[PDB]
Amino acid sequence: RGWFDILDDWLKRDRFVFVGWSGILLFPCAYLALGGWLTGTTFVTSWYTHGLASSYLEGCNFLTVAVSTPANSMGHSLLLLWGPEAQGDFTRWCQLGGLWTFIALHGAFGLIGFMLRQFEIARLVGVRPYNAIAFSAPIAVFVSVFLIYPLGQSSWFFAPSFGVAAIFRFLLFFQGFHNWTLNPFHMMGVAGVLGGALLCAIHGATVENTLFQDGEGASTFRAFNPTQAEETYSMVTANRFWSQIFGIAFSNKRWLHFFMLFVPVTGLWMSAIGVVGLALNLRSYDFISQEIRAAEDPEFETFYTKNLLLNEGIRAWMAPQDQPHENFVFPEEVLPRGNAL
Amino acid sequence: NFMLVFQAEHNILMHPFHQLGVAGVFGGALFSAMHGSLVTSSLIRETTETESANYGYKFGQEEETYNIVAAHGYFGRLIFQYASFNNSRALHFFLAAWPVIGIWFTALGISTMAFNLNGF
Amino acid sequence: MEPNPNRQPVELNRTSLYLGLLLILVLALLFSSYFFN
Amino acid sequence: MEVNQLGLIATALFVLVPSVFLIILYVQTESQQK
């Protein structure tokens, strides 16, 4: 008894879609972030913020639509619909890029709601909350890339825009301006992602190829019962196989599954730290000893100096259209180009 | 250097086979973390708080070391019941197939842009 | 002095030694170029 | 090459300090009663 406990009862009913206290935050914010993205990519332009078409209505396809960031002149304005920029005018708000902060902010609070959901359900079911803990890596990435990075830069304009090709542009921007591939925090991110994909594949394949024969079918999926006490595959045979193939093997299933969390979660967290550095242009851009040698010795060449020439091409060729607020006019005689091309 | 020149000459980012590759490795990393966290979340209590829980599993023991019904009961409520695997064999086949197929396609992306059929 | 009942022995098994040395050495192989710059 | 003059000791202590930590802990585990 008590309205709070009565409400708690209803929120936690076992139903097709669990709600919970966390659902009061999660469902409106997630629905609005997704609905905002679908609305913007279907109907909303980026003509006034970027000089770009970005919706199905204008002729884009699924790969090129986006909800694009606001103009650089907006700074880091929250760009609330009722705020001083749009002043309650829904049409102007869309034209000013208000859907970008709408999606970014409702998305942020929705991710909070989702991780609270992971905690809430784990507590109700009686399991340890490692799934929520693992989800801290997606959150670290989202916050570092969509909030901290632009907050360190001049404006939201330089955050990623919410679109397939828009994100590809973000990747190449980070190469040309930040030399982000050179960054050891990104490199640790890559190791954790590819290492996680490796662990996913090798563990799934190992279980499926050390199965015990627990039925007569040549299709082996039916020969498992969720309530059975026995392991469905042989850890002993799996351990000998990998010991003889690779030299080492798991022997402890609990360590194995913790390691499958540890590797990708740690990798994403490391990539987030590097992006926090890039918010301040605190790049791993150069090796000073390389530059001193190359400056004095015009026969000295490495793949490192080759990639910087590519970066210099990216910046000069992409900046005038990618940064329209700068009003760059680069006479073609100043554009960096190799021979013929 | 190879990646940058490849993008200049083939627009690999706009090629659906590389996009499948990304889905393969992002998804593989996601599913590694998901599977790791769900099994770890439902380890059966066999140790005290001053012991690593890893000592609760003994190499070659016959009994399973976590409660997959508990794990499915969690994950099925996180999303909805029928989005969650209750069959460990189906689950581990999915863990194998998703990254492997994604990497097959991204390898085929490089191997077909090798003949200059390029991204959109 | 009377002994502290909260003391506990500490352990690092051999696999953890190998894993930790691998982490440290590979992290060193990775960051050393940037330390030399 | 004109590298950072502290790069050598930075790398050396980066390896040695945590490696030694682990070796101390490992060896005193082995010496515990079995």
Binding site: - | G60 | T15, L22, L25, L29 | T11
Partner: peptide, 30 residues
């Protein structure tokens, strides 16, 4: 000095591989 450092770390890793394979804790069924 830098080259010595890089090769030294690499050589330690190769040595570590050797001990981790041939002087591992043997897996034991209990």
């Amino acid at each position: 000095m830098e080259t010595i450092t890089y090769v030294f770390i690499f050589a330690c890793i190769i040595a570590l591989f050797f001990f981790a394979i041939f002087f591992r804790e043997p897996p034991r069924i209990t």
